[PDB]
Amino acid sequence: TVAYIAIGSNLASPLEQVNAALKALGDIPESHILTVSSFYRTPPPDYLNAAVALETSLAPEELLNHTQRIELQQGRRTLDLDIMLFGNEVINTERLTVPHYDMKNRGFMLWPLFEIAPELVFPDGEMLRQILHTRAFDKLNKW
Numbered sequence: 571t572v573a574y575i576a577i578g579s580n581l582a583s584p585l586e587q588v589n590a591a592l593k594a595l596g597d598i599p600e601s602h603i604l605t606v607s608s609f610y611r612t613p614p615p616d617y618l619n620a621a622v623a624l625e626t627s628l629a630p631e632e633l634l635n636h637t638q639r640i641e642l643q644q645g646r647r648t649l650d651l652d653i654m655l656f657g658n659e660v661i662n663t664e665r666l667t668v669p670h671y672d673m674k675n676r677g678f679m680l681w682p683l684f685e686i687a688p689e690l691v692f693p694d695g696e697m698l699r700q701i702l703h704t705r706a707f708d709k710l711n712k713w
């Protein structure tokens with residue numbers, strides 16, 4: 571299944587933390603990275619934001635366990651690995667809200683996602699390209 575994960579880091583020099591985190595995501599079992607977006611500089615010092623496409627055979631909460639582990643291990647206020655989408659699934663549990671409960675209100679999540687999945691359709695049928703048009707979120711600057 572293709573999971574889309576958002577990465578956020580607000581360290582002054584976040585590149586090594588993000589690269590450590592990306593490598594770790596690629597080491598998750600029954601999973602592999604498909605594509606990584608560019609790194610974007612976004613106002614809060616700045617955040618570095620990126621999106622990752624991860625193919626995985628894991629269950630959603632199993633993926634969550636891994637992302638939470640990486641946050642603690644690669645964490646140093648903190649590093650953030652948010653599950654934006656999991657296939658076309660709707661998840662509403664105590665641990666997991668998928669799609670991410672606010673991503674549609676955040677240019678810093680949608681723009682890096684649009685770079686790597688421009689044709690994305692949300693589970694409720696909304697179109698990523700349309701949200702970006704209607705909300706008129708300024709394109710982000712690259713890190």
Ligand SMILES: Nc1ncnc2c1ncn2[C@@H]1O[C@H](COP(=O)(O)CP(=O)(O)OP(=O)(O)O)[C@@H](O)[C@H]1O
Nearest residue numbers: 650651652653654664665666667668669670671672
């Ligand atoms: N889609 C999702 N991705 C990651 N964590 C999620 C999630 N949906 C719910 N959570 C829950 O969110 C909890 C708290 O996560 P935090 O990372 O501290 C919130 P945040 O990412 O700082 O703010 P945000 O959710 O407004 O982006 C986790 O313990 C996890 O169970």
Ligand SMILES: Nc1nc2c(c(=O)[nH]1)N=C(CO)CN2
Nearest residue numbers: 578612613614617619650678
């Ligand atoms: N610019 C920017 N702002 C944020 C971000 C983020 O990734 N980028 N993440 C947040 C909570 O998870 C709160 N605010």
Ligand SMILES: [Cl-]
Nearest residue numbers: 669692693694
């Ligand atoms: Cl949705």
Ligand SMILES: [Mg+2]
Nearest residue numbers: 578650651652
């Ligand atoms: Mg977050």
Ligand SMILES: [Mg+2]
Nearest residue numbers: 650651652653
């Ligand atoms: Mg989070």
